[PDB]
Design a protein around this ligand. Structure first.
Ligand SMILES: Nc1nc2c(ncn2[C@@H]2O[C@H](COP(=O)(O)OP(=O)(O)OP(=O)(O)O)[C@@H](O)[C@H]2O)c(=O)[nH]1
Ligand SMILES: Nc1nc2c(ncn2[C@@H]2O[C@H](COP(=O)(O)OP(=O)(O)OP(=O)(O)O)[C@@H](O)[C@H]2O)c(=O)[nH]1
Ligand SMILES: Nc1nc2c(ncn2[C@@H]2O[C@H](COP(=O)(O)OP(=O)(O)O)[C@@H](O)[C@H]2O)c(=O)[nH]1
Ligand SMILES: Nc1nc2c(ncn2[C@@H]2O[C@H](COP(=O)(O)OP(=O)(O)O)[C@@H](O)[C@H]2O)c(=O)[nH]1
Ligand SMILES: [Mg+2]
Ligand SMILES: [Mg+2]
Lengths: 432, 49, 92, 429, 430, 425
């Protein structure tokens, strides 16, 4: 029942999935060997076997064997299946053409076979959870190919995709804007809902709120996994206002071509700061709506809220939920689009979030994750478009794609599709 | 309990710092200098002979 | 592979007597005999020099008190009583 | 996955020997071939550079190759000479005599067939060959011409593979031959045409680092080669060890080569401190970044301030955070925005690997494509033109079989390369 | 309900905050860890954990005092935020603390003020503890006065200010800072209270028989006075008073809002047991010029409004008897237009003795805060100080070199002149 | 908050090394660089002077310079010499030859590039740099010239940061060179604009202190360095330890510099007593005050009766009560209003720090901006005029690219500074 299948594509996908699955195992009380010593709550993420072992419903992919072999040699090797842990022989190396045309096709068939073997087991599959940063070649290329095949062979099943877009200021590649523009077309057409996961916002949030001078990739992935768990706990545990995958994607997607959504989780507070503050529902809601607490480099004041969804966990009550919503509506600093008066979705769960040992986060009574479709995504799209166009002015890092098997006009097509994204955002956000 | 765990983690970090003190004090160049001291000495002795 | 204690015991077992008692009185003659034994153990002069220098290291609060601390310095848990004449029960 | 190395010439042979010394030290492999490493990570990806035998010996995937038997005998008699496979020691009878034509057409031509046979023998044993790396110097006769012949044949045989070339660019301030301009001019065009990346090493800057940075009184060829060996170890760190942000040869190629013929790089190894100031200085990533871009830490002798960085990439070793490896990288991008080209914002890539060099807390290797790399090429083309105007030292090549048309073509390719470097320096958006 | 938000500025602000919060924890039985092993609602904000975070904001420009508080006993009591300091001290520079170095911290200070305000629903007012002698306590204090007045309007605002002494001082630019600060202290402080160290030292020497009086004892006495003034709303009494309740009877005119303080009985353990500390005796001791906390003789001026607040087993019977005796004896005089001149508050909770301190446990006590014309003497002293040091431009370059206009020294001196003039006018007979 | 220091010349290098020795002892840092103190307060603000390496080893935030490598070798060989950083041991090959021209124009100018590189590296390492401290002697060549050019470049690079200088000023009674007046006149005219606050130390008065107040038979330059290092620690104590009435560099400057160019302070330390008299001395606040305000204790060779105190500052350290320091200050003002200036009543600031220097009940340091500081300037100006009317030793200084007219500038700058002090005298 209510199963959800996780796919983690690329280096970034595998690293974020490691933290996400460690959080899932800790919150479901599953030992690293795959057992619960001492309730069908795990059914959506772990497949119960006859012998009593729980196998996660996850699929790891990377054309480079480094991360998957690290997983195989890690503590959770007994938990993770020998299969559903696919590896390649040579990486895409920041090349969408490589990940989509030459080395991606030799592994996509096996990926689809493994997905079929993980989906036929499922009886109430809610949807797919694709974690991939479009900066990388395999995150963009192989991710795009896998999304195309999954969409064409699996009908209209819900598909959430957590994507770490090239962050506007800091980046770890020069071809990364090219990869992002190339993969944006496929991600738009085939991914039902996409979640922004840029880097400056998470890193500044961890620097200021968590008060740690060395916020690193593990901390970023821990926060992302916490966000994923908060979003998906509605079906995992009983709640006052349960929402399923379709339930919130319908309320989050106003038009088929606009589904990219911002995310903001709070109270994301340091351990030392934890019990010295009265973390009320109104306080955490205000902290979430604060631009500084968002996990995306898109300031809300430069855009229009279109449809916001709040996943509350803990002792939250619809009373305080409604009171926080009323205060937020009274506040004039943030602005909602005129033609969507309510614009608010609420999902309440009685299960408080769990903190992993050694993690920077601190366990609290209540928490809330914000997933909001807004016009602020147009500015980050424009930032990456400016990142890309001046590089494409005189064919920088394009001979690789040309010689790898991609036609040159594909870059122009991706540019035009991205420009259509910003223009569609502007047109929809324009006042009636 | 989380406070005690973070204090233990800070103590572990201090222990790591002490171990890195040990490895820095270990940081072979001086031993190579001693070896070349013996080398120039014995070449001098051979020259005198 | 082993520890400091293991290395020390392994090295000192070579100097034990026939009856097995830990012999502690060495002289320069048998010290140099051990040295020449190592000399025939490895024949490269540079490696022998390295071994010897490596194994022998041939050339290698009442004072402070704060007046600000004096505030809560003497008060203890036994001096904290709730006020007798507190405000009445809140009917609001 | 697997990478295979070829060592050409005397300079290339010695640099490869010390490179294998460094790799064996990092992977915990004794000179006798047995394993003695601290942990399992050194064995996890030991197959990238080494090949296991029936008895457990790890023979390096190396082809030590040169005309002169003297260098073969010396490297075999060296401390790690017993590590290499004897059938990979291919040598001729008479040396090339600092003659590019001798090494490329007459003496090396007969022996390059056997070199290619042993290279294909070593490559076919690889499960997934990552590529080749040729260590050599362009100032020599057999280390430049015959190495370029090797690279040409390897390109003709293995199209999709990556051939790193580590070429020690000769400099007249450290001159050792009156034919270095001829050899360099005849070899650079082949390096451009065939080698995917051609990485330049300047012995002037090697001595400069050994003098004003490491404060070595008498830094011999061994001390010179330690820095290049560290660079060759760090360029392929993420292949052999896991890290928070992986990279490899194709990663660096695609993120450092904007145009097909713009594939020449200059190196930097950090940190580098004197003997006394080792434990005194805080080995922090801030000091690492401070020492990263300065000219004194760069072992190529061309001042980077005179040029503009087309691209750059920093491969870090050690446990460091992203807000310690990337935000200050952007800070450098901002505080020296004049030296970085405006049409490629964020000119510099970052990669992180967990395992640091043995003994050192944290490190980084710099791989940078800059407009300043044309200084060497102009200032060696000047000498080539000066010598070729009077047809000096040319009867050797003509007798061996080289026509002056080939030299004219080599100088034309010299000028084409320097012009291509120049016309990306003053370009405006 | 009836919350009072404390804001502590500078050296003296932090020290008096430490003393007063020790006293508040003593009174309300709150551990230094913040627990009881809701009469505290005015000073301690409840959270879910039963631990009570004080409704206080410590602000300073140099990190020593905030570091000391975060390291001391009350580290687990005080919030990690609300305890903020900059990176460089104002350094006895009103211009620095009001124009250059304080501007980068005023925004965060007002953010924390908002955090304090939206927590409480019945805010009675703000209480800022500071000394205008130094740099930050003058400049940053004044700047917070302007921001609080513009962001809160007519909310009650008490300032407990340590003006420079008439006789000796611990700084040379202290008169400049005080003169520059009185402008804000007059325009945006609803009630200001004089707490200079002289009469506190003299009272400690002459009453408690302390051979070595210190800032510790001075701040303990200040905290006793603050607790006495605020305990009317904290505990039940026959005649309770509130912030506005005592303000509207203490200040006759908007410009006349500076008040003297006198707390009695204030005796040592040995002396306390030889006296009949009755209501009449304690009232006479309060009206004695030796018992005041500020060096300013009433006999040289005229009283216009005395707020007497008694704590303990006092009764309105002896309260009225003492008032009658005060009226009868002619050594003190009241102003012509204010016959009553007495606002009396009664509290049933006797002042808690600080263990390890110097005060003695007494059944009944009384603190008197008085608006009177005698403040003209100390204003004349401070303005003569300012004129003497300003005649030939001493230390003015330090003030000017911080984005500061030389003319506001002159306008502040004119403000002092106007204040002294209006005190003389209101004290003039019919 | 953190202060970065520099030592110039042989005198400056020795005295700064001794200052670092006493600071390391006070903060419980052995020469190995590790911390072995007995309190939390020692590590609470150890970053003021020391910078932690990657290992926590506390390298002094000091830059040592001199054209002669002999003093570099001596400071390295010193017992705490290993504490410093080798890269900061910047030095030249040829000495200054006791020439201000060589130290400021030819060798010092060519060597200052690396000096400012090291200083700015230390500044970047610093989080919030409170100020630059410099220690040197105006009577030497490299010390005086090098330090003056230091302060000039430091001022032009960081305008608002506090510039402290510790200048050892020669005296005619203990003169040991013929060109002290030249060097001092060419250095004070730079210190009077480029330095926020300057403190002059006299070898003659130090010797008098050691002879009589300490009753010590044979003190040396080591003991003089003891005396001045106690001063250097006490001036910035409040930046490292908490106190009832804390202070810092800018507080001292603003309370002791009534006019921008009157920042030459005469110093004193207390208590000082011999072994025989230590048991007889009943240490108290009043005893500290009198033994501080008496002339023999202050290491300035300028009699306070000959002048008046513009401003005074007493940085007390140790467990004490503020009432008695307040009484002492008020009573000394009232009883010696003649010694103080009438148009600034209460000329004395008092700051109190809880942590005392090790070895005493409690101590105090005296910052004095007395008008009698003009005496030494006047006498050394007379020396300089006497030499420069007869053209003495001019060729050595002019051969280094310099000319007569800057000496003519320097003498006038000293003269009108003396007149400025005389005006309030
Ligand atoms: N949030 C988050 N971002 C990551 C993580 N790992 C990598 N990234 C970012 O995602 C981008 C793309 O990942 P890549 O380093 O190219 O790895 P990849 O996507 O698998 O592509 P290949 O390296 O060719 O295999 C990188 O530039 C990183 O900045 C992660 O664990 N969490
Ligand atoms: N009563 C009392 N007054 C104090 C205390 N600490 C400082 N002061 C006052 O502060 C005045 C001197 O100002 P500063 O030393 O500069 O202290 P400040 O006013 O807070 O200014 P900063 O030092 O910049 O923080 C003195 O005249 C005292 O009146 C204290 O603990 N108790
Ligand atoms: N880095 C390094 N360079 C060397 C070494 N030995 C020689 N060289 C350089 O190599 C150049 C000569 O190359 P050569 O040996 O004649 O090449 P070959 O004749 O083709 O083998 C000289 O300019 C040297 O600077 C060495 O051990 N290390
Ligand atoms: N107080 C004190 N004075 C010193 C010390 N060393 C030298 N001096 C004085 O400094 C003068 C010489 O200055 P010098 O160090 O040669 O200056 P430099 O040549 O520029 O380095 C002499 O007159 C000494 O009196 C010392 O350790 N302590
Ligand atoms: Mg990868
Ligand atoms: Mg202060």
């Amino acid at each position: 029942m209510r199963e959800a299948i996780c796919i983690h594509i690329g280096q970034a996908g595998c690293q974020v999935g490691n933290a996400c699955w460690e959080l899932f195992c800790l919150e479901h009380g599953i030992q690293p060997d795959g057992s619960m010593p001492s309730d069908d709550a795990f059914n959506t993420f772990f497949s119960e076997t006859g012998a009593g072992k729980h196998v996660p419903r996850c699929l790891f992919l990377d054309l480079e064997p480094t991360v998957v072999d690290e997983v195989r040699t890690g503590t959770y090797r007994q938990l993770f299946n020998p299969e559903q842990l696919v590896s390649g022989k040579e990486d895409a190396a920041n090349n969408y053409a490589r990940g989509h045309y030459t080395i991606g096709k030799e592994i996509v068939d096996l990926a689809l076979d493994r997905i079929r073997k993980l989906a036929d087991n499922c009886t109430g599959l809610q949807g797919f959870m694709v974690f991939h940063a479009v900066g990388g070649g395999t995150g963009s290329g192989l991710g795009a190919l896998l999304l195309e095949r999954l969409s064409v062979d699996y009908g209209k099943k819900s598909k959430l995709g957590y994507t770490v877009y090239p962050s506007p200021q800091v980046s770890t590649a020069v071809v990364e804007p090219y990869n992002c523009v190339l993969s944006t077309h496929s991600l738009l057409e085939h991914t039902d809902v996409a979640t922004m996961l840029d880097n400056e916002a998470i890193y500044d949030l961890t620097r200021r709120s968590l008060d740690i001078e060395r916020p690193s990739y593990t901390n970023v992935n821990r926060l992302i996994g916490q966000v994923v768990s908060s979003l998906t706990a509605s079906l995992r545990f009983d709640g006052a206002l349960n929402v399923d995958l379709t339930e919130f994607q319908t309320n989050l997607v106003p038009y088929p071509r606009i589904h990219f959504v911002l995310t903001s989780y709070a109270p994301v507070v340091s351990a030392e700061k934890a019990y010295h503050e009265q973390l009320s529902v109104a306080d955490i809601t205000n902290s979430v709506f604060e631009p500084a607490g968002m996990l995306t480099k898109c300031d809300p004041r430069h855009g229009k809220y279109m449809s916001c969804c709040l996943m509350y966990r803990g002792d939250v009550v619809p009373k305080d939920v409604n009171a926080a919503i009323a205060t937020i509506k009274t506040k004039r600093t943030i602005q909602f689009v005129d033609w969507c008066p309510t614009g608010f979705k609420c999902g309440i769960n009685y299960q408080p979030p769990t903190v992993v040992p050694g993690g920077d986060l601190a366990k609290v009574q209540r928490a809330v994750c914000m997933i909001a479709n807004s016009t602020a995504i147009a500015e980050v799209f424009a930032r990456i478009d400016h990142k890309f166009d001046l590089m494409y002015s005189k064919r920088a890092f394009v001979h690789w794609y040309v010689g790898e098997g991609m036609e040159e006009g594909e870059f122009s097509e991706a540019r035009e599709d991205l420009a259509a994204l910003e223009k569609d955002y502007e047109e929809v956000g324009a006042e009636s | 309990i989380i406070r005690q765990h973070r204090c233990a983690a800070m103590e572990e970090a201090t222990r790591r710092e002490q171990e890195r003190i040990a490895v820095d004090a270990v940081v072979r160049v001086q031993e190579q200098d001693f070896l070349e001291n013996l080398a120039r000495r014995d070449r001098q002795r051979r020259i005198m002979e | 592979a082993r520890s400091e204690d293991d290395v020390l015991l392994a090295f000192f077992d070579n100097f034990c007597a026939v009856d097995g008692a830990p012999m502690v009185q060495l002289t320069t003659a048998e010290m140099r005999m051990y040295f020449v034994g190592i000399s025939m153990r490895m024949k490269d002069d540079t490696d022998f020099e390295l071994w010897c220098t490596r194994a022998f290291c041939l050339d290698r609060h009442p004072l402070y008190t704060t007046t600000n601390e004096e505030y809560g310095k003497e008060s203890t848990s036994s001096d904290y009583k709730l006020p007798q004449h507190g405000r009445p029960q809140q009917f609001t | 996955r697997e990478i295979v190395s070829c060592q050409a010439g005397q300079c290339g042979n010695q640099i490869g020997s010390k490179f294998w010394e460094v790799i064996s030290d990092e992977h915990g492999v004794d000179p006798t071939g047995t394993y003695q490493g601290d942990s399992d990570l050194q064995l996890e990806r030991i197959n990238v550079y080494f090949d296991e035998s029936s008895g457990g010996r790890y023979v390096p995937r190396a082809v030590l190759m040169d005309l002169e038997p003297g260098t073969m005998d010396s490297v075999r008699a060296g401390p790690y000479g017993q590590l290499f496979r004897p059938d990979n020691f291919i040598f001729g009878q008479s040396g090339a005599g600092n003659n590019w034509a001798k090494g490329h057409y007459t003496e090396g031509a007969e022996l390059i067939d056997s070199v290619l046979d042993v290279c294909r023998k070593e490559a076919e044993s690889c499960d997934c060959l990552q590529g080749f790396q040729l260590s050599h110097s362009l100032g020599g006769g057999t280390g430049s011409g015959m190495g370029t012949l090797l690279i040409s044949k390897l390109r003709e045989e293995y199209p999709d593979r990556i051939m790193m070339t580590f070429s020690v660019i000769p400099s007249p301030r450290v001159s050792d031959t009156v034919v270095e301009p001829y050899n360099t001019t005849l070899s650079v065009h082949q390096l451009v045409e065939n080698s995917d990346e051609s990485m330049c090493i300047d012995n002037e800057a090697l001595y400069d680092i050994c003098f004003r940075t490491l404060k070595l009184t008498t830094p011999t060829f061994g001390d010179l080669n330690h820095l290049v060996a560290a660079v060759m170890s760090g360029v392929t760190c993420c292949l052999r060890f896991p890290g928070q942000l992986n990279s490899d040869l194709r990663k660096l190629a695609v993120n450092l080569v904007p145009f097909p013929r713009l594939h020449f790089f200059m190196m930097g190894f950090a940190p580098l401190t004197s003997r006394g100031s080792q434990q005194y200085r805080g080995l922090s990533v801030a000091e690492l970044t401070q020492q990263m871009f300065d000219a004194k830490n760069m072992m190529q002798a061309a001042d980077p301030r005179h040029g503009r960085y087309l691209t750059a990439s920093a491969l870090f070793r050690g446990r460091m955070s992203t807000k310690e490896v990337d935000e200050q990288m952007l800070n450098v991008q901002n505080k020296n925005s004049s030296y970085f080209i405006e049409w490629i914002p964020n000119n510099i890539k970052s990669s992180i690997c967990d395992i640091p060099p043995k003994g050192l807390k944290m490190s980084v290797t710099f791989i940078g494509n800059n407009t300043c790399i044309q200084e060497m090429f102009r200032r060696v083309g000047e000498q080539f033109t000066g010598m070729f105007r009077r047809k000096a030292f040319l009867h050797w090549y003509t007798g061996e079989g080289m026509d002056e048309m080939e030299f004219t073509e080599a100088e034309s390719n010299m000028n084409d390369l320097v012009s291509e470097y120049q016309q990306y320096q003053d370009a405006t958006v």
